[PDB]
Amino acid sequence: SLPPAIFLMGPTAAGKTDLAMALADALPCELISVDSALIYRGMDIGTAKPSRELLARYPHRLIDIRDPAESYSAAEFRADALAAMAKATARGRIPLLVGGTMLYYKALLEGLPYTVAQLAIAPEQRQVLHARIAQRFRQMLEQGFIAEVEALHARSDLHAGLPSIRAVGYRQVWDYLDGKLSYAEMTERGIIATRQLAKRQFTWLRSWSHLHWMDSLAGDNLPRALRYLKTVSILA
Ligand SMILES: [Mg+2]
Numbered sequence: 614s615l616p617p618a619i620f621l622m623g624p625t626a627a628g629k630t631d632l633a634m635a636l637a638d639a640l641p642c643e644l645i646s647v648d649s650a651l652i653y654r655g656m657d658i659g660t661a662k663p664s665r666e667l668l669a670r671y672p673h674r675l676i677d678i679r680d681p682a683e684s685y686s687a688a689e690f691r692a693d694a695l696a697a698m699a700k701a702t703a704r705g706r707i708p709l710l711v712g713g714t715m716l717y718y719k720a721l722l723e724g725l726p727y728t729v730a731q732l733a734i735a736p737e738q739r740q741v742l743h744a745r746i747a748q749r750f751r752q753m754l755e756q757g758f759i760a761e762v763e764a765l766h767a768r769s770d771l772h773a774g775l776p777s778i779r780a781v782g783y784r785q786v787w788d789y790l791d792g793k794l795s796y797a798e799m800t801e802r803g804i805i806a807t808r809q810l811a812k813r814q815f816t817w818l819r820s821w822s823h824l825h826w827m828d829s830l831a832g833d834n835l836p837r838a839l840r841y842l843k844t845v846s847i848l849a
Pocket of ligand 1: 631661
């Protein structure tokens, strides 16, 4: 009789964090981030990290747990997630792992003493996701993405080749700061990189079994999700 757990994956910008918070208000959950970039402190705007205020009312595990000068392996995620899941479970809370880093989920499922319900969200038309990706990136620039990266760029202990700087978009802003690119080239290439990420995520997901999809444009995802729980043998 393995305790319950929820997986909420999908491409970047699909609306995973949004739905997770919604679900966090419907059931006793423990939000656990599954994102290789959100682990880094000081990388909030460019990574679409939930605001300080939102995190206060929707605490996430595995967020701001590492300095940008540090590395983080899928193996460390593995141990960290298992720890967070056991801790949440002992409290009666349902582990809700939400994120788009597929290698992490993979590491957990393979390398799980839980009855896992797997959800995935994305638009039916990929063109819709691309438009959002482009617009969200432009918003990041307005919210201070460049100044955010300037602070990293100014650290002598950081360089463009580090795992943290590989977070999509950061390398482009970094090169801009090095004066290698124009503002336009930085924007376009940053959007391309993110679109490339979404493509890699769809490839992981398309061959992913036991997934219950949902539409990013749907407005009744909350009730739709709460209903699936029973299907995979889970009494909520
Ligand atoms: Mg998110």
